[PDB]
Write a protein that binds this ligand. Structure first.
Ligand code: HEM
Ligand code: HEM
Ligand SMILES: [Co+2]
Ligand SMILES: [Co+2]
Ligand SMILES: [Co+2]
Ligand SMILES: [Co+2]
Ligand SMILES: [O]
Ligand SMILES: [O]
Lengths: 153, 153
């Protein structure tokens, strides 16, 4: 993925977007629909629109523009924050501590054991299955960063 | 990936962890070191400690347990939050709206054009390359969720 640098560049231009999210939203959708008319056919509420002037006149196209860029902006902001939080952990475990993925499986199993032991009424089979999958996603995230740094975990 | 309920089951049990992070951190490391003694060799400060009674008496071990579960908790709670925004979007766009990944590539191109045209002083070649990579990461995350839902992309 991106550097801390790359993410700040993304978030900086996103700040400009957020100053006029409807204006940006409208332009993005008009640029999409004009460049790739087949995209417009996917929108039951917009596909009647036939001129640039009709698309600009649509109150709801502009509202939908806001909906799209608000959802995306949320996703980019969470991705930047989560990457910046994981990167350091991956880098120390990969470069100084050199913790294989097998060891991360071991501590994952230990966490599942302690939660089962301590919180049975908040950790029956479905909840334990949830946590098992969540810690696997965490290990996969570390693994992916391990390989970018060319460490064999 | 996790269902919406499974992520809440993760958050609910993690609340119980944070209520006594020191105790959980201790029990997790003791379970790791007693279940997998070879993992103890990684820790200069703990690698001499032979028994659970000794491990429980180690203020450094308990201190490290808090650090580990603090780091992991941050990552889990962020992933729970991010996924919960992302999964419904993927679910709606694969199943209800029927939007190919290729179309996500088209709206990404449109976002990059509108940013470059409106904010060139915030969208030089480095910033444009960052945003291009950021939107590819987004589409990759939607394509992963599609594939889980059995949608061809
Ligand atoms: C950056 C990419 C995209 C984002 C962030 C996004 C986000 C949204 C959101 C938040 C909604 C409303 C909630 C929902 O249905 O899930 C929505 C609805 C929808 N999106 Fe997307 N979308 C994107 C791309 C696309 C593309 C490329 C198309 C079509 C070619 C598309 C077609 C639709 C349709 C048809 C709806 C239903 C609209 C209605 O209410 O009539 N989306 N989108
Ligand atoms: C859930 C999994 C894990 C988390 C969240 C985690 C987190 C941390 C954190 C936050 C630190 C301190 C800052 C840093 O150096 O990055 C740390 C240090 C360390 N971790 Fe981990 N860790 C995990 C798994 C493991 C495992 C399985 C091992 C070894 C088997 C390991 C060995 C170490 C070592 C040796 C240090 C340095 C200890 C010191 O000098 O004080 N970690 N870890
Ligand atoms: Co959010
Ligand atoms: Co409960
Ligand atoms: Co955070
Ligand atoms: Co330029
Ligand atoms: O959309
Ligand atoms: O750790």
């Amino acid at each position: 993925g991106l550097s801390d640098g790359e993410w700040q560049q993304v978030l900086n231009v996103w700040g400009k977007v957020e100053a006029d999210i409807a204006g940006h939203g409208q332009e993005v959708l008009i640029r999409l629909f004009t460049g790739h008319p087949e995209t417009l056919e996917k929108f039951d509420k917009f596909k009647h629109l036939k001129t640039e002037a009709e698309m600009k006149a649509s109150e709801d196209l502009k509202k939908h523009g806001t909906v799209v860029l608000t959802a995306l902006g949320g996703i980019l902001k969470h991705k930047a924050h989560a990457e910046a939080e994981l990167k350091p952990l991956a880098q120390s475990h990969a470069t100084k501590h050199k913790i294989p993925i097998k060891y991360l499986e071991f501590i994952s199993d230990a966490i599942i054991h302690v939660l089962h032991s301590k919180h049975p009424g908040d950790f029956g089979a479905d909840a334990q299955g949830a946590m098992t999958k969540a810690l696997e996603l965490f290990r996969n995230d570390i693994a992916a960063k391990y390989k970018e740094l060319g460490f064999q975990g």
